[PDB]
Amino acid sequence: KDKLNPPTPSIYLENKRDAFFPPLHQFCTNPKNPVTVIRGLAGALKLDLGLFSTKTLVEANNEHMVEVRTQLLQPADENWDPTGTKKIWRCESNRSHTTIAKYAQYQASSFQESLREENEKRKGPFKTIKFGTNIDLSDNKKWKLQLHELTKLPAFARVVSAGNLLTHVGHTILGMNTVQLYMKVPGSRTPGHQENNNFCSVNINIGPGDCEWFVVPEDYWGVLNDFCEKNNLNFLMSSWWPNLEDLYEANVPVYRFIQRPGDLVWINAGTVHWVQAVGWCNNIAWNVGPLTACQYKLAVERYEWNKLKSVKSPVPMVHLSWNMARNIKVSDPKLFEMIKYCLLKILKQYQTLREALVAAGKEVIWHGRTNDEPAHYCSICEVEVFNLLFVTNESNTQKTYIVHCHDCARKTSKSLENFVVLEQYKMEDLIQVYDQFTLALSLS
């Protein structure tokens, strides 16, 4: 089917007006567009991509950490087993560390070397390549000029903005409300994945080479999950590179396109994607959470799905929901009904637990909270723990406050005799927030 090769939702910007045009924003966050390619963005805005060139990065922080993925240089859009016998989903992607300076040396000498091969004139076996990924650009002191340049983007695509859910989390979520950098050679692959908790993502290619993108709409993610399971792979945790022939056979539509230097790629919520470098280039990326019913729903879904799969959620959706209710006027009836629903559920579960504890003679200790204090996760199972924290007698005394969830505390200490129950919010206070959370009127 031609419908299994859909056209790419694309927008070409000429100038700043195009970039700040409100219908651009609405196009990207529209659930019907799994991905939007904003062509000419950097030129439209006069973004200095040079601030992110390898030469500049080395000059700025040459000993900065780089996660190295060592991969096979695979042909086109395929992934073969090392023997070259058949196409498989699993990717070879071994991990190590290096520095910007050392990777830069490899990036440059890789290019020089292929120039020489091209002048040598005239199934694998496949060559090995290294991909510099997930470089952490959160530190404003080390990256002042780089991060400042990205404030020139229209508000909806910025790392920080009043309409960004990840800004309302109220604390750093590394790589999500901070910028990540990628340094590449041809064939460098970001394997198949959805974003953390299905949040939208922004990716800008720095150049000078191209990247090639593969995108599958969110509502087909279960088909891919089955493929992973049938091929002995964890959809969330394993490295996999889809066989396009498998997908076509399974009637899954695949968006395919080229991202050129200065092109911004908008990945909508839950959109499945994988990427390979075509030439030598850098990319930068981060997440954004638009205030839409769709984004909140998909984020909640992945949050719950992550519990079943024993995988940590980088976004604390309980902490976030209360912050939204405290601080955001919500005018979309659907989104409002979703948040209200979640808060009511949280509240009921918390009240239920609290009265189990009180009825069993367990003391609830008032503990309160520092402001801008992150959400807490269970030190054992890594589930988010909200409000009632379970801390051992010893950690309490030592004031190290090492957090456990209720189930993990119980599993260790049958009657919780080894724990204290710390409470970060009065119930009256949470009831108030919930009762004052009502639908704001907007005519938009």
Distance of CA 146 to the CA centre of its chain: 20
Those residues whose C-beta lies under 8 Å from the C-beta of residue 219, and which sit 6 or more positions away, are none
367 is in an annotated binding site: no
Between residues 47 and 285, which has the closer beta carbon with respect to ligand FUM? 285
Residue 131 CA to residue 66 CA, distance in Å, equals 9
Q: Are strands 419-423 and 364-366 parallel, antiparallel or unpaired?
A: parallel
Would you say 24 or 409 has its CB closer to Zn ion?
409
Q: From CA 304, how far away is CA 323, in angstroms rounded?
A: 19
Contact segment (CB under 5 A) with Zn ion among 102-110, 122-130, 209-217, 376-384 equals 376-384
Tell whether residue 311 is a contact of Zn ion (CB under 5 A).
Answer: no
**Pairing relation of β-strands 211-216 and 255-259?**
antiparallel
Cβ nearer to Mn ion, comparing 200 with 339: 200
How many CB atoms neighbour CB 206 within 10 A? Answer: 25
* Least spacing, CB of residue 109 vs Mn ion, in Å: 28
Q: How far is the CB of 255 from Mn ion (least distance, A)?
A: 14
Residue (158 or 404) nearer to Zn ion, CB: 404
* Residues within window 176-205 making contact with Mn ion, judged by CB under 5 A: 201
Per-residue contact track with Mn ion, 213 to 232, x per CB under 5 A? --------------------
Cβ proximity to ligand FUM, 158 vs 273, nearer residue: 273
Report in angstroms how near the CB of residue 427 gets to ligand FUM at its nearest: 41
**Is 405 assigned to a binding site?**
yes
Question: Which of 47, 45, 27, 46 has its CA nearest to residue 37?
Answer: 27
Handedness of CA 147, 258, 69, 223 (dihedral sign): positive
* Phi-psi sector, 197: left (phi>0), alpha (psi -120 to 50), beta: left
Contact call for residues 405 and 383 (beta carbons, < 8 A)? yes
Amino acid at position 10, single letter: S
Q: Which is nearer to ligand FUM, 273 or 302 (CB)?
A: 273
**Omega prior to 23 cis, within 30 of 0:** no
Least distance from C-beta 138 to ligand FUM, angstroms? 17
Return the percent helix, strand and coil in the chain, to nearest 5.
Answer: 35, 25, 40
- Is 228 a known ligand-binding residue? no
Q: Determine if residue 382 is labeled as part of a ligand binding site.
A: no
Residues 378-437 that bind Zn ion (CB under 5 A): 378, 380-381, 405, 408
Residue nearest Mn ion (C-beta atom):
201
Is 423 annotated in a binding site? The answer is: no
User: Residues of 136-156 as b/e, b for ≥16 C-beta within 10 angstroms?
Assistant: bbbeeeebeebbebbeebbeb
Considering the complex, what minimum distance in angstroms separates the CB of residue 405 from Zn ion? 3
Looking from the CA of 431 toward its CB, the CA atoms found within 13 Å total 5
Q: Which stretch binds Zn ion (CB under 5 A): 62-70, 75-83, 106-114, 372-380?
A: 372-380
275 binds, among ligand FUM, Mn ion, Zn ion, none (CB under 5 to 8 A by kind): ligand FUM
381 is in an annotated binding site: yes
Residue closer to ligand FUM by CB (options 135, 335) is 135
Please give the residue ranges that form the binding site for ligand FUM (CB under 6 A): 182, 190, 201, 203, 273, 275, 283, 285
Sign of the Cα torsion 71, 75, 78, 83 reads: negative
Q: Which residues lie below 8 Å from residue 226, measured CB to CB, with a gap of 6+?
A: none
195 annotated among ligand-binding-site residues: yes
Judged by beta carbon, residue 77 or residue 81, the one nearer Mn ion is 77
- State the minimum distance, in angstroms, from the CB of residue 324 to Zn ion: 25
Binding-site residues for Fe cation sit at: 193, 195, 273
Binding-site residues sit at: 193, 195, 273, 378, 381, 405, 408
Binding-site residues for Zn(2+) sit at: 378, 381, 405, 408
Residues lying near Mn ion in the complex (CB under 5 A) are found at: 201
